[PDB]
Each structure stands twice: as C-alpha cells, then as structure tokens.
C-alpha cells in the first residue's frame, strides 16, 4: 500500500464477517481471530541468537489490513488515483462483472452470497 489505509469506521461489508479477518481492537495484541488461531499454533549464551523484526506482528497486520480492506470495498482505487466511493454491493457487482458473471447474481442472491463466504470462513 502506498500508505496504510484505514479500515472504514463503518464495517459495511454486506453482512460479511470481516471482523474475523481484520485485527480485533479490544485485545492487547492487535490480531484477528484467524490470526490468533495460527499464532497460538506456529512457534543463547552459546553464541547463537535471534534478532527482532523491524515490522512487528501488529505492524504487518496494519499493512495487511490496509491492503485487505481496500481489496474488499474499493480494490486498487486507494492506490492508482484518489479513493473511489464504491459501496460494497457495487464493488461486488463489479467484482462479478469482471469475471464474466452477470451482476444480477449479486442482487438476486445478495443473502446467499453473504452466507457462503461467511460459512466458508
């Protein structure tokens, strides 16, 4: 991302559970539930030591989330030019048109689309 993009203050992802993907602000460790699951599972004087990262897990999450939040509601419009106000349902309509699928699927099945992503997550 050119600059870290804010995750919008209004989580209008069309009913999608992005709160499981993006960092949880209420925790001392700013990680998402997906991240907590992985981080809890993936784990001297003899001269061999390990140096710290520059970008900490939270800092990586900030760059990652900027890219991710952009991807779901605005695509690359927060990069190549000023940001575009595409509401999530229109971003999705364009998302389907872009793969050769009619936009009618989004509107006619908006509720099933919302449920299939969330079910899979």
């Amino acid at each position: 991302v050119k600059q870290i993009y804010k995750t919008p203050p209004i989580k209008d992802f069309g009913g999608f559970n992005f709160s499981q993907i993006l960092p949880d602000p209420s925790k001392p460790s700013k990680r998402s539930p997906i991240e907590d699951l992985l981080f809890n599972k993936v784990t001297k004087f003899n001269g061999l030591t390990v140096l710290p990262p520059l970008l900490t897990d939270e800092m990586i999450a900030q760059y990652t989330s900027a890219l991710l939040a952009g991807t779901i509601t605005s695509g690359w419009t927060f990069g190549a030019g000023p940001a575009l106000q595409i509401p999530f349902p229109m971003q999705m309509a364009y998302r389907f048109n872009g793969i050769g699928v009619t936009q009618n699927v989004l509107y006619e099945n908006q509720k099933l689309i919302a449920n299939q992503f969330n079910s899979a997550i």
Binding site: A80, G81, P82, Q85, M90, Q103, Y107
Partner: protein, 108 residues
C-alpha cells in the same frame, strides 16, 4: 512480452496503474526499462447507479457505471468520466427495477 510488446494488467508488474507501454534499454550486466502506466490524477464524486429503470426493467451499462446527478443520466467508465446517452446501444437489459439498488427511472 507483457508491457513492451503488450498490455498486461498484472497488478504493479511494470509499476502501479494500468500498463500502457515499456521501453527496454541496454545496461552493463542487465536491462533497464522505462515503464509507462495510466494513473487517474483528478476525480470528482458523482451520484451513481448500477442501472436505469425503464418499463420495470433494469438497463445496465454494457461496461462502466451510470452517472445519476440532477436531471440527466449517462454512462461512464470507471477509469474515465466521459458520459454517454442512455440508449440500447450503450446499455443492456436484464433483471428488473426491484433488483437493482439505486436504480433510477429514465427514458431509454
């Protein structure tokens, strides 16, 4: 193959933006490219819609977004604001007026 001799859309491959062209140059031990992309510079916020409502049907742009401010409606592309007339030559019909969010009644 993809930027010098063509227009790949791989993201950020030859730089950020839509690829237009690329110009290779010689160099000691290597290659130099002058990479050229299309990037929007100024944009304005226009009232929009996915479709125009006419006789109960939804008229979708063949490509792009509908511009829906004031008393006139038109078709523009996401990458460029050059509004076209709402005709069956620029739009197509599917779905209906009770399906599209923001659909606006207009003579097609």
């Amino acid at each position: 193959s993809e930027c010098v001799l063509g227009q790949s859309k791989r993201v950020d491959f030859c730089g950020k933006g839509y690829h237009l062209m690329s110009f290779p140059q010689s160099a000691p031990h290597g290659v130099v490219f002058l990479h050229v992309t299309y990037v929007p510079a100024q944009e304005k916020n226009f009232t929009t819609a996915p479709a125009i409502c006419h006789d109960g049907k939804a008229h979708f742009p063949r490509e792009g977004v509908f511009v829906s401010n004031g008393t006139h409606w038109f078709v523009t592309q996401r990458n460029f604001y050059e509004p076209q007339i709402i005709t069956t030559d620029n739009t197509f019909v599917s779905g209906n007026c009770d399906v599209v969010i923001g659909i606006v009644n207009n003579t097609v």
